[PDB]
């Protein structure tokens, strides 16, 4: 029981190019999506592990 | 080496607060601490650039040293680690042995200058002066701060006193 649950959502994620088509078929257990998001790729960076002000 | 800082001119003088080398004149006037603008500025400038292309040497483009892989995947963690490790170490040891190696090129330098700054002095003044030691001239004829200002900039005027300074000498 992590979280006082015993099932489990497994999570999925894709990046549908320019011009190109997502097909969802399914008779049960879909979390469907709701929002996306559209991306452009920038300088390679990272993620900052750290407890610091911002400023 | 050259022979000249720690060599045979013993000490530095801290009464000289304008420049690196220079003179220090003793006359019926007064004595004084002068230093020798043109040596200092070429030192200066040498120094300058040596400390601006150590500087400016070292170009970077963005980049993100971390990554996070999972569990499975054990060889990519210690690639990485590897290609880490091995930047730091070369950059580690090249700085470190640069410095050491920078400091003795300074420092011959600046034994290089006094030394040639002496040895100027020195063939400016040819036999109208005595070499005592310590870097330190003795005349053999009187001088004023015109005569004294005339060796510092470098234009001092044997034929002017070589008779005096024969007279004095041979004696």
Same mark, same amino acid.
């Given at each position: 029981?992590?979280?006082?649950?015993?099932?489990?959502?497994?999570?999925?994620?894709?990046?549908?190019?320019?011009?190109?088509?997502?097909?969802?078929?399914?008779?049960?257990?879909?979390?469907?999506?709701?929002?996306?998001?559209?991306?452009?790729?920038?300088?390679?960076?990272?993620?900052?592990?750290?407890?610091?002000?911002?400023? | 080496?050259?022979?000249?800082?720690?060599?045979?001119?013993?000490?530095?003088?801290?009464?000289?607060?304008?420049?690196?080398?220079?003179?220090?004149?003793?006359?019926?006037?007064?004595?004084?601490?002068?230093?020798?603008?043109?040596?200092?500025?070429?030192?200066?400038?040498?120094?300058?650039? @040596? %400390?601006? +292309?150590?500087?400016?040497?070292?170009?970077?483009?963005?980049?993100?040293?971390?990554? =996070? $892989?999972?569990?499975?995947?054990?060889?990519?963690?210690?690639?990485?680690?590897?290609?880490?490790?091995?930047?730091?170490?070369?950059?580690?040891?090249?700085?470190?042995?640069?410095?050491?190696?920078?400091?003795?090129?300074?420092?011959?330098?600046?034994?290089?200058?006094?030394?040639?700054?002496?040895? @100027? %002095?020195? +063939?400016?003044?040819?036999?109208?002066?005595?070499?005592?030691?310590?870097?330190?001239? =003795? $005349?053999?004829?009187?001088?004023?701060?015109?005569?004294?200002?005339?060796?510092?900039?470098?234009?001092?005027?044997?034929?002017?006193?070589?008779?005096?300074?024969?007279?004095?000498?041979?004696?």
């Amino acid at each position: 029981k992590v979280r006082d649950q015993e099932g489990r959502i497994n999570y999925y994620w894709t990046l549908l190019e320019p011009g190109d088509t997502i097909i969802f078929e399914a008779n049960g257990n879909l979390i469907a999506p709701r929002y996306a998001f559209a991306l452009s790729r920038g300088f390679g960076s990272g993620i900052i592990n750290s407890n610091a002000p911002m400023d | 080496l050259f022979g000249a800082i720690a060599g045979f001119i013993e000490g530095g003088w801290t009464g000289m607060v304008d420049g690196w080398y220079g003179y220090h004149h003793q006359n019926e006037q007064g004595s004084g601490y002068a230093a020798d603008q043109k040596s200092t500025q070429n030192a200066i400038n040498g120094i300058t650039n @040596k %400390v601006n +292309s150590v500087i400016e040497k070292m170009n970077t483009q963005f980049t993100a040293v971390g990554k =996070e $892989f999972n569990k499975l995947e054990r060889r990519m963690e210690n690639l990485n680690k590897k290609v880490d490790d091995g930047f730091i170490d070369i950059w580690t040891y090249n700085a470190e042995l640069l410095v050491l190696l920078e400091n003795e090129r300074t420092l011959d330098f600046h034994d290089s200058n006094v030394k040639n700054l002496y040895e @100027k %002095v020195k +063939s400016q003044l040819k036999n109208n002066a005595k070499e005592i030691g310590n870097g330190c001239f =003795e $005349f053999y004829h009187k001088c004023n701060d015109e005569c004294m200002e005339s060796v510092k900039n470098g234009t001092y005027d044997y034929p002017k006193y070589s008779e005096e300074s024969k007279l004095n000498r041979e004696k």
